[PDB]
């Protein structure tokens, strides 16, 4: 019967796809306890045009009238500085998401993190419009050449100098290292923020998923349902991520990277789709971690305050002022999330018990 | 055509299962270029009795009369020193294979490698009978307690102290660290063999698979068909394995760990079966590596000489004196291996090119 008032919760890294999948999962943002969602653009084809991002947002709002949607473009050679200014001036986007080519779902149209300079006109326009640059910070794999090989376990660490160069070259650009998975990345974000004294001083932040606070390599070795990018790494990495999430620092906040796939796309003998589905119980998953760490006092900062501050979400843009309330009523995660038609998704931690449930309080 | 006479080739780590799968796969030992096969025992139930291992060998010999079968027991709670002596004296087994409990396929009846002491009477009997102790050298994963976490990436390295203690405590026992996957393991096998002058000096050997000479973690992360145990690890590990395989050292030789699974046991969202199926093109896979490494002169040692020497295979045990001839005919690995009934297997490197092919020639002398 214990309750925690989390206010206007934020999930700053959401995939809702299109079609019937989108109709199934978009109402789960609210059901999982999230008021505000930052919507990723890696559709097929990626979202790179104004009319597409406008229609997509209106489609989400039709499906969930109480959810606040922040939208993004997919970083691509199709983008122009003029397009960035137009989209920003119409409040059609809040940021631009960068996928390195080949590293994850629908990243074939993505970029080379060896030649980010080709997108400096875009970053310049984003900086002028106070838009956020979201990075999938993994270098593409390479096992040859003059250089130490890059593989799924060190690809994030190998990306960190690209992060530092972007922050150096665009010091007023807000940049997010999305879904951090390595101890090395946590330390880099902390070191970048060494001189920050209030939350509004943060320019470079990192999001943390629910599933990387639980998983290590042992959990997805043999279990495609736990396979995502960046891959869950070693116990020392998991410990560093959990310490960061409960740290109370303004430069870490919640982004689930909830990535829904129909079960048949996870049960492949080759080319398994990467992604973990956590939307249905997003805030309860996080509460489990914060309870185990005796850090529930810091839950609201991680899932509400810090994301709102970083994205400068105004009360005038919220779709609903309802507050998310956690209450300590145990529940069992179902085996599947289904639309009763052709889509079944296996949820993260299917079959496990969670100590907290989430409801909504007006005003 | 360029040809290499590989003679009596051996694959010292073979799974052929039972029933219809066995009927499909056992003929592929010969088709893949292998004369001598060491047959692993992790059946359901595991092979732990004399009559079972005798009847199993008879089944295999019927399916492949020209293949030489060396048999093993599974290291289980039920094994007794008297049974080791009995099976050895009847030439019913050449060794005993140890699976750490829970680490891989049909390992639930296996051991705790943290307390091997309960099996020391078995190892003493094996040592007296000159039987080989085959180790799946991985410690089971542990994430609780206060000691070192163990996970799929360091479980082999974590096992290496256990290997050294067994070698120290049973210095005359032939021991194989099966399917090595880590640079750490290669270094340990190399240092155990620091003072070895000829092949017959080797007491502790290691087998290397075909697929660990190709694969890294990147290749199985989203590809269940490439998932096996021990998992393929980092590029630095694969570098060490390939260098060991072409080293010409007598303490490394070929064991495929070819592990057939029906495709439906790989296309799972959880509990993907561990194992790569390499039998159908076993020797051509290895030839690919030795060619790319410019070490084809060392191929015969890796796939024939060293395994025959370590297991002390005699001409009198040999089911057929046919010689395996590698010839430089490019070929394309199929997408599926099937029996035309209910079984389809995805072979290793399905769809790829191989520079070599294999055929058989009689001994005419
Ligand atoms: Zn991503
Ligand atoms: Zn994502
Ligand atoms: Zn094994
Ligand atoms: Zn095996």
From Swiss-Prot, chain B:
Gene3D superfamilies assigned to the protein according to its UniProt record, in alphabetical order: Metal-dependent hydrolases (3.20.20.140)
Gene Ontology MF terms: dihydroorotase activity; metal ion binding
Record's keyword annotation contains Transmembrane helix: no
GO cellular component terms listed in the entry, alphabetical order: cytoplasm; nucleus
Cofactor: how and how many bound: Binds 2 Zn(2+) ions per subunit.
EC number: 3.5.2.3
Catalytic activity annotation: (S)-dihydroorotate + H2O = N-carbamoyl-L-aspartate + H(+)
Metal-binding keyword on record: yes
Entry's induction text: By N-carbamoyl-L-aspartate.
GO biological process, one term: pyrimidine nucleotide biosynthetic process
Pathway(s) annotated for this protein in UniProt: Pyrimidine metabolism; UMP biosynthesis via de novo pathway; (S)-dihydroorotate from bicarbonate: step 3/3
Swiss-Prot/TrEMBL keywords: Hydrolase, Metal-binding, Pyrimidine biosynthesis, Zinc
Annotated CDD domains: DHOase
Residues binding Zn(2+) 1, per UniProt: 13, 15, 97, 257
Pfam families (alphabetical): Amidohydro_2
Coiled coil: none
Cofactor: Zn(2+)
Top-level taxonomic group: Eukaryota
Binding-site residues, Zn(2+) 2: 97, 136, 179
N6-carboxylysine modification, residue list: 97
NCBIfam families assigned to the protein according to its UniProt record, in alphabetical order: pyrC_dimer
Biological function: Catalyzes the conversion of ureidosuccinic acid (USA) to dihydroorotate, the third step of the de novo pyrimidine biosynthetic pathway.
Additional facts recorded: Present with 12700 molecules/cell in log phase SD medium.
Family per similarity comment: Belongs to the metallo-dependent hydrolases superfamily. DHOase family. Class II DHOase subfamily.
Name of protein: Dihydroorotase
Organism: Saccharomyces cerevisiae (strain ATCC 204508 / S288c)
């Amino acid at each position: 019967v214990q309750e925690i008032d989390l206010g206007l919760t934020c999930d700053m890294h959401v995939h809702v796809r299109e079609g019937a999948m989108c109709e199934l999962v978009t109402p789960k943002i609210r059901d999982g306890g999230v008021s505000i969602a930052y919507i990723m653009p890696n559709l097929q084809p990626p979202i790179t045009t104004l009319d597409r991002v406008i229609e997509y947002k209106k489609t989400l709002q039709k499906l969930a009238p109480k959810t606040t949607f922040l939208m993004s473009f997919y970083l691509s050679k199709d983008l122009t500085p003029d397009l960035i200014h137009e989209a920003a001036q119409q409040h059609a986007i809040r940021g631009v998401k960068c996928y390195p080519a080949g590293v994850t779902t629908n990243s074939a149209a993505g970029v080379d993190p060896n030649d980010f300079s080709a997108f400096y006109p875009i970053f310049k326009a984003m900086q002028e419009e106070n838009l956020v640059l979201n990075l999938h910070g993994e270098k593409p794999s390479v096992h040859d050449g003059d250089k130490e090989p890059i593989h799924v376990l060190n690809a994030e660490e190998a990306f960190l100098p690209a992060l530092k160069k972007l922050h150096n070259d665009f010091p007023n650009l807000k940049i997010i290292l999305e879904h951090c998975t390595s101890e090395s990345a946590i330390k880099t974000i902390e070191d970048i923020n060494k001189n920050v004294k209030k939350a509004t001083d943060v320019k470079v932040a990192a999001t943390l998923t629910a599933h990387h606070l639980f998983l290590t390599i042992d959990d997805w070795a043999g279990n495609p349902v736990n396979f995502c990018k960046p891959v869950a790494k070693l116990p020392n990495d998991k410990k560093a991520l959990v310490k960061a999430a409960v740290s109370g620092k303004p430069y870490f906040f919640f982004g689930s990277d909830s990535a829904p796939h129909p079960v048949q796309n996870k049960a492949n003998y080759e080319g398994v789709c990467a992604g973990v589905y956590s939307q249905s119980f997003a805030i309860p998953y996080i509460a489990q971690v914060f309870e185990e760490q005796n850090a529930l006092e810091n839950l609201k900062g991680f899932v509400s305050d810090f994301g709102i501050s970083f994205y400068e979400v105004k009360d005038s843009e919220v779709a609903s002022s309802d507050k998310a309330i956690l209450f300590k009523k145990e529940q069992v995660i179902p085996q599947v999330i289904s639309d009763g038609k052709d889509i079944s998704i296996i949820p993260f931690k299917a079959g496990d018990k969670l100590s907290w449930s989430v409801r909504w309080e007006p005003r």
